Scaffold this active site. Structure first.
Site, mmCIF file in Angstrom:
data_model
loop_
_atom_site.group_PDB
_atom_site.id
_atom_site.type_symbol
_atom_site.label_atom_id
_atom_site.label_comp_id
_atom_site.label_asym_id
_atom_site.label_seq_id
_atom_site.Cartn_x
_atom_site.Cartn_y
_atom_site.Cartn_z
ATOM 1 N N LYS A 117 -18.293 62.588 94.545
ATOM 2 C CA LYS A 117 -18.436 62.081 93.185
ATOM 3 C C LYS A 117 -17.242 61.235 92.758
ATOM 4 O O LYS A 117 -17.406 60.247 92.034
ATOM 5 C CB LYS A 117 -18.625 63.254 92.227
ATOM 6 C CG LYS A 117 -19.782 64.165 92.614
ATOM 7 C CD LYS A 117 -19.968 65.353 91.685
ATOM 8 C CE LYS A 117 -18.683 66.143 91.474
ATOM 9 N NZ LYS A 117 -18.136 66.698 92.744
ATOM 10 N N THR A 118 -16.034 61.606 93.180
ATOM 11 C CA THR A 118 -14.829 60.870 92.794
ATOM 12 C C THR A 118 -14.659 59.538 93.524
ATOM 13 O O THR A 118 -14.295 58.532 92.905
ATOM 14 C CB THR A 118 -13.598 61.737 93.039
ATOM 15 O OG1 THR A 118 -13.783 63.014 92.422
ATOM 16 C CG2 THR A 118 -12.365 61.080 92.464
ATOM 17 N N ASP A 164 -12.289 62.332 85.237
ATOM 18 C CA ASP A 164 -12.906 63.077 86.324
ATOM 19 C C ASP A 164 -12.623 64.570 86.219
ATOM 20 O O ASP A 164 -11.600 64.997 85.680
ATOM 21 C CB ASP A 164 -12.408 62.571 87.675
ATOM 22 C CG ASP A 164 -10.973 62.948 87.936
ATOM 23 O OD1 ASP A 164 -10.243 63.189 86.952
ATOM 24 O OD2 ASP A 164 -10.571 63.010 89.116
ATOM 25 N N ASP A 165 -13.551 65.355 86.767
ATOM 26 C CA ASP A 165 -13.487 66.816 86.780
ATOM 27 C C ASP A 165 -13.393 67.376 85.362
ATOM 28 O O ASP A 165 -12.423 68.026 84.976
ATOM 29 C CB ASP A 165 -12.322 67.306 87.641
ATOM 30 C CG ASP A 165 -12.657 67.326 89.117
ATOM 31 O OD1 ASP A 165 -13.858 67.345 89.455
ATOM 32 O OD2 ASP A 165 -11.718 67.333 89.940
ATOM 33 N N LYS A 181 -17.161 59.068 70.888
ATOM 34 C CA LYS A 181 -17.987 58.403 69.879
ATOM 35 C C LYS A 181 -17.363 57.122 69.312
ATOM 36 O O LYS A 181 -18.053 56.105 69.189
ATOM 37 C CB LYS A 181 -18.325 59.375 68.756
ATOM 38 C CG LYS A 181 -19.377 58.828 67.813
ATOM 39 C CD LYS A 181 -19.822 59.842 66.775
ATOM 40 C CE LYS A 181 -20.531 61.025 67.412
ATOM 41 N NZ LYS A 181 -21.815 60.624 68.044
ATOM 42 N N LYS A 221 -18.211 65.791 102.438
ATOM 43 C CA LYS A 221 -16.875 66.369 102.425
ATOM 44 C C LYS A 221 -16.799 67.608 103.297
ATOM 45 O O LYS A 221 -15.718 67.966 103.771
ATOM 46 C CB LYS A 221 -16.452 66.701 101.001
ATOM 47 C CG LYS A 221 -14.958 66.866 100.843
ATOM 48 C CD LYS A 221 -14.596 67.167 99.405
ATOM 49 C CE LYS A 221 -13.097 67.137 99.177
ATOM 50 N NZ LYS A 221 -12.763 67.105 97.727
HETATM 51 N N1 LIG Z 1 -19.634 57.748 101.650
HETATM 52 C C1 LIG Z 1 -18.592 58.416 101.147
HETATM 53 N N2 LIG Z 1 -18.515 58.572 99.814
HETATM 54 C C2 LIG Z 1 -17.477 59.237 99.305
HETATM 55 N N3 LIG Z 1 -16.448 59.798 99.941
HETATM 56 C C3 LIG Z 1 -16.550 59.629 101.259
HETATM 57 C C4 LIG Z 1 -17.562 58.967 101.931
HETATM 58 N N4 LIG Z 1 -17.339 58.988 103.298
HETATM 59 C C5 LIG Z 1 -16.216 59.652 103.417
HETATM 60 N N5 LIG Z 1 -15.680 60.062 102.226
HETATM 61 C C6 LIG Z 1 -14.456 60.831 102.050
HETATM 62 O O1 LIG Z 1 -14.853 62.120 101.626
HETATM 63 C C7 LIG Z 1 -13.998 62.554 100.557
HETATM 64 C C8 LIG Z 1 -14.802 63.514 99.727
HETATM 65 O O2 LIG Z 1 -13.907 64.204 98.832
HETATM 66 P P1 LIG Z 1 -13.894 63.890 97.287
HETATM 67 O O3 LIG Z 1 -12.872 64.696 96.593
HETATM 68 O O4 LIG Z 1 -13.801 62.382 97.090
HETATM 69 O O5 LIG Z 1 -15.330 64.319 96.844
HETATM 70 P P2 LIG Z 1 -16.002 64.907 95.531
HETATM 71 O O6 LIG Z 1 -17.462 65.042 95.678
HETATM 72 O O7 LIG Z 1 -15.515 64.055 94.367
HETATM 73 O O8 LIG Z 1 -15.281 66.304 95.418
HETATM 74 P P3 LIG Z 1 -15.423 67.677 94.649
HETATM 75 O O9 LIG Z 1 -16.569 68.455 95.181
HETATM 76 O O10 LIG Z 1 -14.085 68.368 94.851
HETATM 77 O O11 LIG Z 1 -15.576 67.278 93.191
HETATM 78 C C9 LIG Z 1 -13.774 61.258 99.802
HETATM 79 O O12 LIG Z 1 -12.501 61.416 99.193
HETATM 80 C C10 LIG Z 1 -13.560 60.266 100.943
HETATM 81 O O13 LIG Z 1 -12.256 60.554 101.419
#
Ligand SMILES: Nc1ncnc2c1ncn2[C@@H]1O[C@H](COP(=O)(O)OP(=O)(O)OP(=O)(O)O)[C@@H](O)[C@H]1O
Ligand SMILES: Nc1ncnc2c1ncn2[C@@H]1O[C@H](COP(=O)(O)OP(=O)(O)OP(=O)(O)O)[C@@H](O)[C@H]1O
Ligand SMILES: Nc1ncnc2c1ncn2[C@@H]1O[C@H](COP(=O)(O)OP(=O)(O)OP(=O)(O)O)[C@@H](O)[C@H]1O
Lengths: 537, 107
Positions: A346-347, A400-401, A428, A505
Site C-alpha cells: 500500500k505504501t 500513511d498508516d 474538510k 511483501k
Molecule cells: N509491485 C510492488 N508494489 C509494491 N511494493 C513492492 C512491489 N514489488 C516489490 N515491492 C517491495 O515490497 C515492499 C512491501 O512493503 P511495504 O511496506 O511497501 O508494503 P505495505 O503493503 O505498505 O506494508 P504494510 O502491510 O506494513 O502496511 C515495498 O516496500 C517494495 O519494497
C-alpha cells in the site's frame, strides 16, 4: 571641482557576484541615482540622498563579498571597517567617545568644504552585537542603551549631515532597534536568498574560468549536469566543492607515508576529471538546510514489478486524479483513499504515485518520526505540516498508516480522540484562495474507519489487490528470477492444482528464508512454506 | 541483503527456560554490538521513561553496521494483568512501530 562618484575603470563582470544581479540593480537604482545624474537637474529637484543600507540573510551568501565590492567600486576616502563589538571599553563613557570618533572627520569635512566634498564609508559588520533592543538587553549596565542613543543621535541629529554612507549586515534583523530602521537612517533592507539554477551555473563558471584558461580542466566536465545535481547548495558550498575536487586531483602525485615526496614530472601533467567531482559530492561535502532531500530509497527499496494487470490500473487512476486536480476551479480540494489487505504494498504505490506527480511541494507525514509523542505533540506536528503545505501554490501530502496514527488497539477499543477530530477538520477545510491541495491516505482496516464515520470525508477509494492466480505467481518469480527453469516446472506441476493467496511483501520473505537451505531441499522447503502460511481466502 | 531486518519470537510454557536459551543464542552470534533490554532495570518507571529508554537503546543499535537486541518478558514490559484487562497503550504503540522500521542504509 568635478569629482566623479564612480571608478572609471569598473565593470560589472569583474565584481563576480553571480545571481544577485537583480538585487544589485535595485541597490544601484535606489542608492546612487541621485549622484550619477548631472548636478543642475538634481539642484532644481532638490532631492536628498539615502544614508543607510541593511543587508540580511541566512549564512553563506554574498553579503560580505557584496560589501567589499561596493566599497571597492567607489572612488573616495577609504572605508573604515568595524569588526563587531570592538567598541566596548571598561571605563565609564568610553564607548560613546569611540563611536563619535568615527564620524568626527566627516562632520569636519562637511562643515569646512560645504556640499562639494567627497564620500566617506563606514561599514558596520555584525550590527546585531550592538543595536539590540534597549528594552530587552540585560539590566546589568547602561552602556548598551547609551551606545544605541549615541548612534541614533549622531547618524541623524539636529545638525544635518548628508555626505556619509553606512552599510550594515546581520543574521537576525528583527531584533534591531526600530528607531534605527526608519527612513533617513537604515532604510533600504534586502534579503540575499539561496541561489537558483542559473545562479549556480554562474557561480560555477566564475570559479572554473581560471582553470579553464590554462587547460587544467578536462574537456569532459559538464557544468550543467553539476548544476542540475547540486540542490540547495549555497555559494560557500559551491566553492568548497571545487576546492575539494582540486585537492583530490592534486593529492594523486604525493607520497606521505615515509618522508614526503612529489614527482616533478607528473606535477606538470595535472588535470581534474569529472570522477573527482562525483566522488566529492558524496564523501566530503553535504548540503545543510535545503528543502526535500527525500529518502525515497528507504520507502521504495525495490522499485516496482508489474506482476499483473492491477498495478497498471491503480497507477492510471492516480495519474487521472493528479491531472484533474491540476486544472480546476470549482473544486480546489481532492482527497483519495488507498486501502487493502496487509502486506500488499500500500505504501510503495502511494509514494510512487506521488513521485510521478511533479508538484513543487511534496511531503509525507508518517508516525515513524513520532515515537513516544503525547496526545498533544501529534496535533502540533500535523498542524505545522499542513501550514507549510498551504504556502506553496501546489501541494500534495501523504498520510500513511492511519490506524497507527490513532494509537488504535482492539481490546477496548482505545484511541486518541483529539487526533481524530483534528484529522477530520483538516481534511474538510479548503485551502487559501487560488492554491490547490491533494491528500492521499493509506490504511489496512477499512471497516474500522467506516465505524468511526470518517470514510465519508474522503472523496474516493482505491482497492489494492494481492496475488490471486498461480500464473501470476510464476510471472512474479520469473521477474525476480531467483530459480532455474527445472525448479520452475517442478513448482508449477503442483502449484497449478490450487489457487494461491499471498501478499508480495511476504513472498519476498519466504524466498529469502528458502534460499538459506541446501540446494537439494530448497524447492521442498519453499513448497512447505507456501502451503502452511497461504491458508486463507 | 534484501531482508535487512529479521524478527523471531521464542515462546512456551512458564518456568521452562526461554530467557536463558535466548541469551545463549545472542552470545554465540559473536556480533559486534549486543544489548539486552530487561524490565528489571527500570522498576517504578512511568510510560515516558520506558519509551525513552527503549528509544535510546535502538538509536545506539543503529550505529553499528550489524547488531543483535533481546527484548525479554514482553508481558511485564507492558503492564498486563488479567483483571480488566489493564495495560499501557503507549509502550505497545512504541513496540509495534519499532518492529517495522528499517535501519539506515546498508545495516
Ligand atoms: N509491485 C510492488 N508494489 C509494491 N511494493 C513492492 C512491489 N514489488 C516489490 N515491492 C517491495 O515490497 C515492499 C512491501 O512493503 P511495504 O511496506 O511497501 O508494503 P505495505 O503493503 O505498505 O506494508 P504494510 O502491510 O506494513 O502496511 C515495498 O516496500 C517494495 O519494497
Ligand atoms: N553569490 C555568490 N557568488 C559567488 N561567490 C559567492 C556567492 N555567495 C558566496 N560566495 C562565495 O562564498 C564565500 C561567501 O563568503 P561571505 O563572507 O560573503 O558569506 P556571508 O554569509 O556573507 O558571511 P557570514 O557568514 O558572515 O554571513 C566567499 O568565498 C564568496 O566568494
Ligand atoms: N537445558 C537447559 N535449558 C534451559 N535452562 C537450563 C537448562 N539447564 C539448566 N538450566 C537453567 O534453568 C534456568 C532457567 O531459568 P529462566 O529464568 O531461564 O526460566 P524462565 O522460564 O525464562 O523464567 P520465567 O518463568 O520467569 O520466564 C537457568 O538457571 C538455566 O541456567
Amino acid at each position: 571641482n568635478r569629482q566623479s562618484i564612480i571608478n572609471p575603470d569598473w565593470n560589472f563582470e569583474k565584481m563576480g557576484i553571480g545571481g544577485l544581479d537583480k538585487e544589485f540593480s535595485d541597490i544601484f537604482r535606489r542608492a546612487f541615482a541621485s549622484r550619477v545624474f548631472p548636478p543642475e537637474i538634481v539642484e532644481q529637484m532638490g532631492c536628498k540622498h539615502v544614508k543607510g543600507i541593511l543587508l540580511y540573510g541566512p549564512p553563506g551568501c554574498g553579503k560580505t563579498l557584496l560589501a567589499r565590492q561596493i566599497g571597492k567600486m567607489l572612488n573616495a576616502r577609504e572605508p573604515k571597517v568595524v569588526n563587531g563589538p570592538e567598541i566596548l571599553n571598561k571605563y565609564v563613557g568610553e564607548s560613546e567617545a569611540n563611536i563619535r570618533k568615527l564620524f568626527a572627520d566627516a562632520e569636519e569635512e562637511q562643515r569646512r568644504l560645504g556640499a562639494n566634498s567627497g564620500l566617506h564609508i563606514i561599514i558596520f559588520d555584525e550590527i546585531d552585537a550592538i543595536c539590540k533592543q534597549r528594552g530587552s538587553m540585560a539590566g546589568s549596565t547602561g552602556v548598551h542603551d547609551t551606545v544605541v542613543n549615541q548612534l541614533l543621535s549622531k547618524i541623524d541629529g539636529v545638525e544635518q549631515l548628508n555626505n556619509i554612507l553606512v552599510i550594515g549586515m546581520t543574521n537576525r534583523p528583527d531584533l534591531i532597534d526600530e528607531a534605527l530602521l526608519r527612513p533617513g537612517r537604515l532604510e533600504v533592507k534586502m534579503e540575499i536568498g539561496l541561489p537558483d539554477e542559473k545562479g549556480r551555473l554562474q557561480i560555477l563558471h566564475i570559479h572554473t574560468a581560471r582553470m579553464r584558461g590554462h587547460q587544467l580542466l578536462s574537456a569532459d566536465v559538464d557544468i550543467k549536469e553539476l548544476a542540475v545535481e547540486t540542490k540547495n547548495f549555497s555559494g560557500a558550498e559551491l566553492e568548497g566543492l571545487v576546492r575539494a575536487a582540486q585537492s583530490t586531483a592534486m593529492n594523486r602525485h604525493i607520497k606521505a607515508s615515509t618522508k614526503v615526496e612529489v614527482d616533478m614530472e607528473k606535477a606538470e601533467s595535472l588535470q581534474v576529471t569529472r570522477g573527482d567531482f562525483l566522488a566529492s559530492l558524496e564523501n566530503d561535502i553535504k548540503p545543510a538546510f535545503g528543502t526535500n532531500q527525500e529518502d525515497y530509497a528507504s520507502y521504495i527499496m525495490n522499485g516496482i514489478i508489474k506482476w499483473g494487470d492491477p498495478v497498471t490500473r491503480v497507477l492510471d487512476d492516480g495519474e487521472l486524479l493528479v491531472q484533474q486536480t491540476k486544472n480546476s476551479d470549482r473544486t480546489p480540494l481532492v482527497s483519495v483513499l488507498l486501502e487493502g489487505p496487509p502486506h500488499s504494498g500500500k505504501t510503495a504505490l502511494a509514494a510512487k504515485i506521488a513521485e510521478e506527480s511533479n508538484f513543487p511541494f511534496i511531503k509525507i507525514c508518517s508516525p515513524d518520526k513520532m515515537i513516544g509523542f503525547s496526545e498533544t505533540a501529534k496535533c502540533q506536528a500535523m498542524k505545522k505540516i499542513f501550514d507549510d503545505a498551504y504556502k506553496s501554490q501546489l501541494s500534495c501530502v501523504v498520510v500513511d498508516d492511519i490506524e497507527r496514527l490513532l494509537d488504535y488497539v482492539p481490546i477496548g477499543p482505545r484511541f486518541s480522540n483529539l487526533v481524530l477530530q483534528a484529522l477530520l477538520v483538516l481534511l474538510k477545510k479548503a485551502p487559501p484562495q487560488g492554491r490547490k491541495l491533494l491528500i492521499i491516505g493509506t490504511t489496512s482496516r477499512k471497516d474500522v474507519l467506516q465505524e468511526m464515520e470518517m470514510l465519508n470525508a474522503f472523496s474516493t477509494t482505491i482497492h489494492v489487490p494481492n496475488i490471486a492466480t498461480g500464473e501470476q505467481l510464476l510471472e512474479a518469480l520469473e521477474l525476480l528470477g531467483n530459480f532455474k527453469d527445472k525448479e520452475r516446472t517442478t513448482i508449477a506441476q503442483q502449484v497449478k492444482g490450487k489457487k494461491v493467496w499471498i501478499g508480495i511483501k511476504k513472498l519476498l520473505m519466504l524466498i529469502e528464508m528458502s534460499l538459506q537451505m541446501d540446494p537439494e531441499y530448497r524447492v521442498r522447503k519453499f513448497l512447505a512454506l507456501l502451503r502452511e502460511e497461504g491458508a486463507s481466502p
